Structures are given as C-alpha cells and as structure tokens.
Design a protein around this ligand. Structure first.
Ligand code: NA
Ligand code: NA
Lengths: 337, 334
C-alpha cells in the first residue's frame, strides 16, 4: 500500500484544467516525487460533497483535504476570505509576496487552526474579469436590481450597490444564466469563462473584476492528517503546493490571451467599468470593511497586515513595473512588436 | 546524491544567491538528507560569470546563473533568461511552463551538456546607477557601463561601452571609476551592493530585463543519472524555488526603494526618446541575429509570438485594475 492515501474534494468542475486541474498537478507532483507512496486522489465538485462546502468536509475529517477558495466560507467568518481575496486587495504577485515572505501563511493558519485546517496557497487566477451581462453597465444605477452570481465576500459589497448576489459553484452557473434565473455572472477570466459558455447568452464582458485582483486558491488540509505526516512528507507537501500555486497562475497566463481572442472572434463585446463605477464600488467596500474590522478582531488582524503591504506594493509597482509594461503595451498597439 | 552547485551570485544577496539555498533545503528536506546539494557562492569554485562552463565541463554537477552571461559563447543562451524588450516575469513563466519554453531551451542546451530549469525571476529590473542625469541618447555616448548579458550589444549601438562583471565585484569598479555607471537588479539588491554612494541617479525601467529568469543548470549526465523519481522532485523543487525568489523580491523591493530614496537616491524615468532609441537598436540587433543564428531564431520567434499575445491581454483586466489601485494609492485612498 502507499505510505499515504488521501482524498481531495475540489470546489471546481472537471472541465477547468486551470483551477480544477491544480489539484491534479499537486497529485502528480507528489506521487512522482515518492514513486507512488504519497497518493492524493482528486474529486471534482459534487463528487464527494458540493463544491461550495468542500472545506466543511475537511474540518469534519470526511476527506483529508480540499482545493477551494477561502471566500466561499465568508458566511461562517469573513476572515476566511482575506487570504483568498476580498475586493480591492493585492495582485497575484503582491499577495504571494505577503503569503510566502510577509507572514501571510502563518497568519491564515493561526486563524484556521480552530477550524481544524492547515492551508497553503494552491493557485492564483490573476486579476479577474468583470463578469458577463446582457446589457451595458455604464453607471452604478445600471447595476441596481441585477441578480448576479458573485463569489465570496464580494456579495456583501454588491448588496450595498443594489445588486442581488447569488451563490453558485462554477459548473452550475451556466444553466442558471441560460434559464434566466440569474441576469449576470462573474467567474474568473477568458479561458475558464469561455469554457463555461456564458458568452452564448450574455455578450457584454466587463473588466476589471475589482472583487478579485489576485485570488489565491488554497489547498486546505485536515489538521490531524497533516500533522500525522512525517516531517519529510510535510516539507514535500509545502514545496509541491508552492510549485502548483505558481503553475496555475502560469497556465492562466498562457491560456487567457488565446481565449480572449476566441471570445472576441465569436462576437463578445469587451467593455471597461467606468472610473465612477470603480470609485463607487471602492467606497462600498471601504464601508463594509470598516464595519467588519470593528466587529471582528481576526478579520482586522489579517486585513491590516495585507493593507500595510498593499500601500507599499502599489507605490513600488508604479516605478519599474508600470513603466516597462506600459511601454510594451504602447509598442504592441503601435504594431511595433 | 551528493552534488556541488556553483552560484554566479554573491553570498550577501539572500534573493538571487539565496535561491540556490532554497532549492538545496527543499531537496534535502523532501528526501531526509538523501539528495544533497552543497551550495557555493560566486568565486568559490569558479568565477561567477563562468559558472555554466564548469557544468558543461563536468567539474560541478550544477550551477545557478543567468543564461545571458554566456551570450559571448552564443546569444541563444540569453533568450530564456532575458534579452531587452522581452516578457514580464509572469509572461516568461507562462512561456517556460506552458508554452514549450523549457523544452525549447533544453533542446538548445543538450549539445552543451546542460539540462536547465527556471530557478528565479527578479521582475522588471531598474534602469541602473549614474553619476549624473541622462536625458538624451547623446548623454549615454561613451559611458563605461556594467551591464548584464546580450544588452551589451544593444548598448553598443547607443555608444555605450559595456562590460560584464559578477555581482560582488561591481562596486569596487564603480568606486575606482573604471566604470561610469552600472545596472544590477533592483532596489533590495542594489542597496545592499551600495552603488548609491557613488552614483546616486537611479533610472527606470531597466528595459534590458523585463523579467529575467535565473536558471538552475544541471550537468546532463548527472541529471540523467537520477532516478525518474528524483528527476521529477528536482523539477518540482525548481518550480517552487523559481516562484519563491520572485516573491522575495516582491516583498523586499517596496521597503528598499523607500530606504534608497531616504538615503539620497534620485529616481529618474528614462525619457520616451531614450526608450524608443533603445527599442529600435534592439530590433536591429535581433533581426541581424535571426538571419545569422538559426538557434537564436528558433527560440526568439517562439518568445515573440507569445509576447504579442501577452501584451494584448495584459491591457485588459490587469492594467485596468493595477492602475486603478495605483491611482488610489497616490490619492491617499488606500
Ligand atoms: Na470570481
Ligand atoms: Na541586470
């Protein structure tokens, strides 16, 4: 028998080789590095438990681990969302700096301990798109009354803008959109969103998804199961999560440019959210966080840590990074690349 | 497995040198000490700029280096590391891991007895350290500048007199005045190396290295001698160490740039005219190189194809979000 056989419940549908596939990547890293002695068996959303309930099964010990986004559990405690994403937080590179070198992994694990979980980053999507709409969104008034599928704590922010948020796992969004039980949806980005098929119903694809600037997709491990590993397997697990985390982001970065082109070729209309909309959403988020920080000490501790770095990050990003990337985009648009 | 690793980098830099220690620790811990890589800093086993030569020659089993140091052997060595006006860190990594880049570079490196995997990235580099402001292309005429890699050839077209010097040995050359100016990496590393004391004008961006990969290069015989299990573990650990280095730069640089400015560093953007002239010079160099060097053409054409796609997509969600956040930062709203 293998030294260790674990089951992993995914929050994600098997169609998505990006976000669901990250668990398969981890599994292969581990079995290959151990000649098959460390086996993580991977199950798509709904196979063992509903996708939005994956972490609950980990806490209960019904599965040894899951691959999920922490913000799905905002209803239990909004603190769950912070190391995944909340609106107007860090970019992928920013949050990863914080995770791996700013004490972020330990801060989140200190919170998660009481929930019988030890977690490590297990992917990032980069800046998300702004979702799929049947009509133009030019003002915040245009958002009022929209039944929109939204992930995580962004639902609470959306509520203050007059949106009616709905909670739906990835693979079950499309039928609700097609049948008209939701008006609009966000998911992730061009590759995934094209695969899920929204563009055949809703033709307006907005950007940016200010709700998720750089969301981490955690591997969450049952605390007992993790602590029962040898130090050798524990270290290998952390190394492999670190690699799989990067791998998912890199896969999105490879696939998204091709998928955006496909969506546009098929007639999809890309549109920016106006600066006014973004400001209104920022102000709504600020109010929600102010209330949450005051009433929830665990939330305040982690959010204050993220914000402290966030200001420094967006100061430095304006120097080499912004100027280089802007120059290259200008060259691209001028036909010079 | 008992290997030695020759680093191109000075031991003071826990970022770029430190990446080798990170890999060694990942491997030792994952194997209870059975896969051991002894790490040596620049100049310990071989000079920093010659690390890969030691691997080709089989004198050491591996190195941690930047491929562009070997541009004089073949400019193709530079492409999967960085050449001017290439991909960002996220862009080059998409290409390495999902665009066939790792295999393409390894197809080139096979004849040189090397198997390589990405082993770090610095993100967009800074524009170097100068004793006085440079506002025009004419201003850089005749400047003796330390610059890494194939950027030297591009710099020569602008009248710069380039040379490569390993990290650790740049500062004394700058202090003595044997070089007028230097580039290295970015605020954290450059502050440690101390250039601001001599040459306080710090330009940006370092258009020569938008997202340079720092490779682990393994002797082909040594790599092929590993069990498939250890080969896979090695690739997984390199993948994690590659991410880790970029993440450490991203954490440390924001603090270091503020420290440098507090210590008297004068941040200056390169003028649009300088950037355009450097771009046109690089374009000329690459067109010539593609015609004379089939190996270079093969890899550069692959990177170029993706570069166009990347810098189209990056204009959409990413640019709009990150620029909004920068505007909020500047307005005091964060
Ligand atoms: Na989302
Ligand atoms: Na450099």
């Amino acid at each position: 028998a293998p030294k260790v056989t674990w089951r992993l419940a995914s929050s994600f549908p098997k169609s998505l080789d990006t976000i669901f596939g990250g668990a398969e990547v981890l599994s292969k890293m581990l079995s290959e590095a151990t000649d098959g002695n460390f086996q993580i068996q991977v199950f798509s959303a709904g196979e063992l438990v509903p996708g939005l309930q994956a972490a609950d099964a980990v806490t209960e010990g019904t599965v040894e681990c899951c691959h999920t986004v922490g913000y799905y559990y905002w209803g239990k405690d909004p603190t769950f969302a912070l190391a995944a994403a909340v609106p107007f937080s860090l970019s992928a590179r920013g949050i990863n700096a914080w995770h791996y070198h700013g004490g972020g992994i330990d801060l989140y694990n200190e919170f998660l301990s009481q929930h019988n979980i030890v977690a490590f980053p297990g992917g990032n999507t980069g800046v998300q798109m702004g979702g799929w709409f049947r009509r133009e969104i030019n003002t915040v008034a245009d958002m009022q009354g929209l039944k929109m599928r939204v992930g995580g704590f962004a639902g609470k922010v959306m509520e203050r803008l007059g949106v009616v948020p709905q909670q739906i796992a990835g693979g079950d969004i499309y039928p609700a959109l097609e049948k008209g039980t939701i008006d609009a949806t966000e998911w992730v980005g061009p590759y995934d969103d094209e695969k899920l098929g929204f563009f055949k119903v809703a033709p307006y694809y907005y950007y940016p998804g200010w709700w998720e600037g750089g969301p981490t997709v955690h591997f969450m491990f049952n605390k007992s199961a993790y602590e029962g590993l040898t130090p050798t397997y524990q270290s290998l697990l952390r190394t492999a999560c670190h690699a799989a985390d990067a791998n998912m982001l890199q896969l999105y970065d490879w696939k998204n440019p091709t998928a955006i082109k496909s969506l546009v070729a098929q007639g999809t209309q890309l549109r920016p959210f106006s600066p006014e909309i973004l400001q209104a959403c920022f102000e709504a988020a600020n109010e929600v966080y102010a209330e949450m920080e005051a009433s929830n000490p665990a939330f305040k501790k982690i959010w204050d840590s993220i914000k402290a770095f966030r200001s420094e990050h967006y100061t430095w990003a304006q120097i080499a990074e912004y100027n280089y990337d802007t120059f290259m985009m200008v060259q691209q648009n001028a036909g010079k690349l």
